[PDB]
Design a binder for this molecule. Sequence first.
Ligand code: HEM
Ligand SMILES: *[C@@H]1O[C@H](CO)[C@@H](O[C@@H]2O[C@H](CO)[C@@H](O)[C@H](O)[C@H]2NC(C)=O)[C@H](O)[C@H]1NC(C)=O
Ligand SMILES: [Ca+2]
Ligand SMILES: [Ca+2]
Length: 336
Amino acid sequence: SVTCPGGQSTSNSQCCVWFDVLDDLQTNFYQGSKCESPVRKILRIVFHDAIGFSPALTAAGQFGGGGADGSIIAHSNIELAFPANGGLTDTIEALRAVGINHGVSFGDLIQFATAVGMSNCPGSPRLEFLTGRSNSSQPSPPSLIPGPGNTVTAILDRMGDAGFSPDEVVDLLAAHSLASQEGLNSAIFRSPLDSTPQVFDTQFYIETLLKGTTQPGPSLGFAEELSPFPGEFRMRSDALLARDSRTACRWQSMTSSNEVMGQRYRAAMAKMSVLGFDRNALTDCSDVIPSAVSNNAAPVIPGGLTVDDIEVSCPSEPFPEIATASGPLPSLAPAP
Ligand code: HEM
Ligand SMILES: *[C@@H]1O[C@H](CO)[C@@H](O[C@@H]2O[C@H](CO)[C@@H](O)[C@H](O)[C@H]2NC(C)=O)[C@H](O)[C@H]1NC(C)=O
Ligand SMILES: [Ca+2]
Ligand SMILES: [Ca+2]
């Protein structure tokens, strides 16, 4: 049955080249299978590539975008001029070379590089991986990427038009658990968005809900809000979404269980990976993706803060009783 040249077993002969690009990415792009800045940049790239898709434009005669077609790489020259795509150039070039070297389509390569990057981060689910997207793309229309200064209504309209309900917008945001910013406030380069930028866990949902207390750098940056402690950056769209009535209750159910957040994230990401394609036209190669080490820490309210410091926004569900740490307030180092 399907034994790939190097003896691994797989569902289908189209999955065998993906064991080679797996080794190239882990050794080179991920520097020895690490969960550091390349993983974070790839997670931003899969969303900015997949979200250039608009049924609204199609419906009014315009090209609405091919979705998760690898257009951000193939037409990087037009797409990396978009406001939202700053700081992605060096990662787009690294990906272009791996894709030209193994003969895989750019849309498939981005989805693959996302599932492999997440396997290096403790706590991550095994994301579905499908191969078969055509390498031909057209440039994404501008203005389809949500910005950090947008209102929650604007973000829900855009995501909604792409096909996501408010609940799936909160689920998709589990990726800000492995995250930092470099261009919203350059004085505090790589400031994490939660206290564990290398662990895919619930902390992001807990910490954006705490009262904004600290200005982390010398001045405020683009769409920056006050954060709960030294070194953490809080962006305006994440603060608004945690608190708005349309999304506040789903953001609250995401704080207590890494298992529920993970399943929810995996399901939204699987949907987002096929925007612009018919998943029944693709071949399933999920089994090429390895397991992530498990995360054994339980959700906590960091540094001595208590439930009295989180701004409860869901008016029907009471807050989960989460553990507290007997700590002095943390100060976060920049994410690696
Ligand atoms: C509600 C929409 C969202 C907005 C407005 C948004 C906005 C941003 C912004 C402005 C940054 C900081 C970029 C920088 O200056 O370096 C950021 C970082 C990041 N975002 Fe989002 N984001 C959203 C949704 C998502 C989604 C759905 C994913 C992916 C599944 C994602 C993954 C990331 C990651 C991993 C980073 C960290 C990158 C790094 O550390 O270099 N974001 N996001
Ligand atoms: C996918 O399409 C892109 C073109 O859009 C191809 O990329 C080019 O590949 C050649 C050599 O094959 C390079 O010299 C070019 O610089 C690449 N162009 C871009 C824009 O990156 C790529 O080869 C295609 N891949 C496959 C397997 O069809
Ligand atoms: Ca695209
Ligand atoms: Ca985290």
